[PDB]
Amino acid sequence: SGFRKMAFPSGKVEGCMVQVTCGTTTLNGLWLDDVVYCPRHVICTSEDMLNPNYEDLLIRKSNHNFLVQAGNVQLRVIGHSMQNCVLKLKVDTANPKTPKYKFVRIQPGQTFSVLACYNGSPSGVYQCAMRPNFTIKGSFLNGSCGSVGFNIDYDCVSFCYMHHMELPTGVHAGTDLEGNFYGPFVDRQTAQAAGTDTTITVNVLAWLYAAVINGDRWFLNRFTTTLNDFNLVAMKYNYEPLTQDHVDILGPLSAQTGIAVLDMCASLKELLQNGMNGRTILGSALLEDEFTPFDVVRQCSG
Amino acid sequence: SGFRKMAFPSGKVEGCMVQVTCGTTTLNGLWLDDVVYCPRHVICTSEDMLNPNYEDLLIRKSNHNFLVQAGNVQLRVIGHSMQNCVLKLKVDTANPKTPKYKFVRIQPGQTFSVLACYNGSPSGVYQCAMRPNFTIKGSFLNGSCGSVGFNIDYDCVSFCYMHHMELPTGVHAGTDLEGNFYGPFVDRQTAQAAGTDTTITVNVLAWLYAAVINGDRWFLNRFTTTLNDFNLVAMKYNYEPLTQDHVDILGPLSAQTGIAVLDMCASLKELLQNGMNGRTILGSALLEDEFTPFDVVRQCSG
Ligand SMILES: *[C@@H](CCCl)C(=O)c1cccc(C(=O)N[C@H](C(=O)OC)C(C)C)c1
Ligand SMILES: *[C@@H](CCCl)C(=O)c1cccc(C(=O)N[C@H](C(=O)OC)C(C)C)c1
């Protein structure tokens, strides 16, 4: 019993974190086999941050301009290249702790664990969701760039996020491990801002099932609704549309609780229209949308 | 920016988790140097669960009755003993991954990371607080017994919790690493239940400071209060009394935000008396009390 925002165990990732310094700029890197991955803005300085041409900046560097430290061991850089917004530093040593891994790009509404790091040293681990507007609501301080987001499936680490910046609203933006940004953000100084966001409906319904599995039932009702009528309400409250595929994905949880998906949707409609009247669900007084159906099944199966 | 429930990186702990089987009962153990620690109820069977005499149960076992598996390696048990409600299994191999560690008992209102494990395999990591009534609101399924709670300070792991059981309300109880229960709970089948609980005031105030540091200011006011008047309100809302030591502990956060502790207490009094009028603080619609002053300083310093 119980329902917590749970992250994957971080040890496999911890053994990949290093510190990358170029000039007086330092940040974190990810050491896999004989390559270190980090944000390419490590080669930029305060003077070029407005319209930097990264191809020019990199052509003017050599391997000796990069210091890579893995704990108290200095790694010799033997090559450097750029891939989109990530820098690849070839080092002369393959990381002996490299896990089985994949570079996967995630979808908005999916969750992942973040290992916050500073100066190549892990500091904390927590769960995040990619928002519909392609930002993440992280916890990151100065020096956290290069920290990564990941999921683990049977000892294989699927890396999905590298941290690059903080937007003016305090939310965060970055890229996939191939250096391609999530969202319409760039690694330079502009007035860029998070676009409008929406609530991830399928996740809210998953979490209502979690709650039922954990004995919170007060929000249930005898009613049902059609998908079309439900989605009329969703649109009114800035919730994403629910699709038949979402209904199918919720099938297992529906079957375990005996509550049809469109029945739980009737409950969600009532909650949106009426609030909670002072009650809580799984210890929250608002509707939580950063648990996927998979997250719920993982933590609630028993 | 940002504020998340953040756990410590779990890798140091992950390398200590093993599986312990006695008969058909299996659970998790903690392998440090050449000792494996686990709940002593692993030696109990369904027939004895009402009034087990553990001294009798253990005298009837030998080393060969315990199977310890560390990954795919079987560890040879060469001794067994009991210490309060934990079993100590001496094995013939010192864990090469043993971190620097301490066994420390924590106070109600303090937080710690939990590494949930099944069959000696880590599954997830999350933050918990020891409640004033000595329970924890965890996330644990069948097979999670023997999972541990810990804090990490400069590479030294302070273990503070081993998981033993789930109470009827779905909250959790266990012991310290010396096998002494937190709270008035026992490792046998009774009608035992969590006692009345209260909210951890000093932590709520810490979190209000976190919020101010992260730009949530709407709940601030021009008022102050005395400690005595504040505590009259606290008692009315089932909040713990605030002490001068709590005020002193909040000194740094007060100084960073420029908001005197008793000023923030005036804000808390208004929030308790009036609710939030539909607003949120750090993405919550209720007052959060599972962050200590230390947790806030760790995550907000920048
Ligand atoms: C980024 C963490 C943000 Cl939450 C981080 O650790 C970091 C390290 C080093 C340098 C920067 C940085 O800000 N670089 C500039 C920038 O602001 O990005 C747009 C450059 C000069 C464009 C960040
Ligand atoms: C406990 C996890 C609870 Cl959230 C766990 O993994 C476990 C493993 C093996 C056996 C038990 C168990 O329940 N034992 C009995 C009990 O219910 O504890 C009071 C014994 C027989 C007293 C739990």
Explain this structure to me?
Two copies of one chain form a homodimer. Helices cover 23% and strands 27% of the residues of chain A. Chain A is built from eight helices and 13 strands. Chain A has helices at 11-14, 54-59, 201-213, 227-236, 244-249, 251-257, 261-274, 293-300; strands at 17-22, 25-32, 35-39, 66-70, 73-75, 77-83, 86-91, 100-103, 111-118, 121-129, 148-153, 156-166, 172-175. A seven-stranded antiparallel β-sheet of chain A has the order 5-4-1-2-3-7-6, with no helix packed on it. The longest helix of chain A has 14 residues, at 261-274. Chain A is elongated. The A-B interface holds A 1-12, 14-15, 115-116, 122-128, 137-142, 166, 170-172, 214-215, 280, 283-286, 298-299, 301-302 and B 1-12, 14-15, 115-116, 122-128, 137-142, 166, 170-172, 214-215, 280, 283-286, 298-299, 301-302. Bound molecules: the ligand *[C@@H](CCCl)C(=O)c1cccc(C(=O)N[C@H](C(=O)OC)C(C)C)c1 (2 copies). One copy of the ligand *[C@@H](CCCl)C(=O)c1cccc(C(=O)N[C@H](C(=O)OC)C(C)C)c1 is lined by residues 25, 27, 41, 44, 46, 49, 140, 142-145, 165-166, 187-189 of chain A.
Which helices and strands occur, and which strands form pairs?
Two copies of one chain form a homodimer.
Chain A: H1 11-14, E1 17-22, E2 25-32, E3 35-39, H2 54-59, E4 66-70, E5 73-75, E6 77-83, E7 86-91, E8 100-103, E9 111-118, E10 121-129, E11 148-153, E12 156-166, E13 172-175, H3 201-213, H4 227-236, H5 244-249, H6 251-257, H7 261-274, H8 293-300
Parallel strand pairs in A: 8-12
Antiparallel strand pairs in A: 1-2, 1-4, 2-3, 3-7, 4-5, 6-7, 9-10, 9-11, 11-12, 12-13
Helix pairs in contact in A: 3-6, 3-7, 3-8, 4-7
Residues 25, 27, 41, 44, 46, 49, 140, 142-145, 165-166, 187-189 of chain B line the site of one copy of the ligand *[C@@H](CCCl)C(=O)c1cccc(C(=O)N[C@H](C(=O)OC)C(C)C)c1.
